[PDB]
């Protein structure tokens, strides 16, 4: 029905900490995945885009928190954390610590301290209709073979080939003087394809007489010896 895409950059050694049922320092006091997370942990390396030869004062980890965070919780407040018996109404003292800190991602650091962009695909599985569209999927294009075609409702079978006919750009189907679909339009490539009837005919068994012999020959009327010894 509706997928929620949440993107965030974390450290290079906490890729597996954000998992259903995991107690991590950045998985408990931050965005937490519950035991019913039916999404993915799709992530990649970003050591080229997010890297910068500077102090890297753009990312943080948000470790200092009073209590544990609920799953899918986004804390926007910037209040000063209080450890215990030390209220800081102004600036943070010795016991008071700020809830933010620069996440230094040096380009010389190896695997474990590199910036990794992690985005979870939280799939809301509420039993509800799939908004506006459900299937609406197409396959590839097989030609020069009698197969079943289902081009935008038109059902049947035949040898789909290529035709040198230029349809006007408002007509989709195509017929003849016998009310038979003889040409269709590819709904994907917007090309003109010729639909020809599947190769059929009549089998005729040539028999010189059972009294003479038993060797017989078959005749496939209307076949070019390609659709199935002398």
């Amino acid at each position, epitope marked *: 029905t509706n997928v*929620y895409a949440d993107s965030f950059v974390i450290r290079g050694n906490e890729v597996s900490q954000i998992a259903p049922g995991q107690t991590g320092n950045i998985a408990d006091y931050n965005y937490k995945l519950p035991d*019913d997370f*039916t999404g993915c942990v799709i992530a990649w390396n970003s050591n080229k885009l997010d890297s910068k030869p500077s102090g890297n004062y753009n990312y943080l980890y948000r470790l200092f928190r009073k209590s544990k965070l*609920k*799953p*899918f919780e986004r804390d926007i407040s910037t209040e000063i954390y209080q450890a215990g018996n030390k209220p800081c109404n102004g600036v943070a003292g010795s016991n008071c610590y700020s809830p933010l800190q620069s996440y230094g991602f040096r380009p010389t650091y190896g695997v474990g301290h590199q910036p990794y962009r992690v985005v979870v695909l939280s799939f*809301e*599985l*509420l039993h*509800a209709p799939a908004t506006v569209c459900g299937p609406k999927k197409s396959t590839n294009l097989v030609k020069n073979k009698c197969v079943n075609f289902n081009f935008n409702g038109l059902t049947g079978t035949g040898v789909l080939t290529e035709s040198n006919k230029k349809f006007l750009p408002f007509q989709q189907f195509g017929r003849d003087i016998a009310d038979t679909t003889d040409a269709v339009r590819d709904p994907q490539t917007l090309e003109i394809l010729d639909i020809t009837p599947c190769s059929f005919g009549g089998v005729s068994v040539i028999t010189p007489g059972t009294n003479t012999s038993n060797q017989v020959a078959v005749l496939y009327q209307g076949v070019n010896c390609t659709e199935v010894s002398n």
Partner: antibody
Amino acid sequence: QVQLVQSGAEVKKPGASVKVSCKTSGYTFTDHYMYWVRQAPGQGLEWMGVINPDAGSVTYAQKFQGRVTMTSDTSTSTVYMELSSLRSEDTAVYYCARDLFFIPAANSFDYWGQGTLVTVSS
Amino acid sequence: EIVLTQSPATLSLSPGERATLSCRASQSVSSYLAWYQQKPGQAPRLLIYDATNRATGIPARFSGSGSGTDFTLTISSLEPEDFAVYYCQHRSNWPRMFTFGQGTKLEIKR
């Protein structure tokens, strides 16, 4: 303080539809889900069902399955519940319950309303 | 759906002792269970959620535990404001079919 205000008493007739609202307050009506549960006199909670504050992505119960509609409204942050074709066994007190988790997950019901005595008789 | 059934259905004890009310199920609900408390004259309140941790605004006397298919509530000391009806609810992941039981009334032994 998060307090869910609901309606009071409301009478109807067999073969009609009752509109009962339950307005939210205290929290932003964009991240917390809500459930509409029925409490019968002497019995307990019977049917589940969640309404999405963002979109109309809802999930009705299996007992009704069609004869109930739950809309959403982000203007005044108020939910709605319209039960159709009320019978002699639907007379009970309806409640609106929130959840401790956000939109994706849902654990249990923590914040409840006050109730709405919906009865069907002259 | 998992028919949540309560065997005792009537817990008549005295204020001050310990109480143990059970609500068993069939499917593995070791991590999928919720406990409520409905007092007569108002709306039910959340007592213990997830059946493993403590809820907010709940005194220390309420202690819940259990795993597998047998769960029970371990109240430390009964109080006059604790006599109410408790329920149980499981949280299925995919099929949202949250059901309930019948309720256990807590009586006073005069």
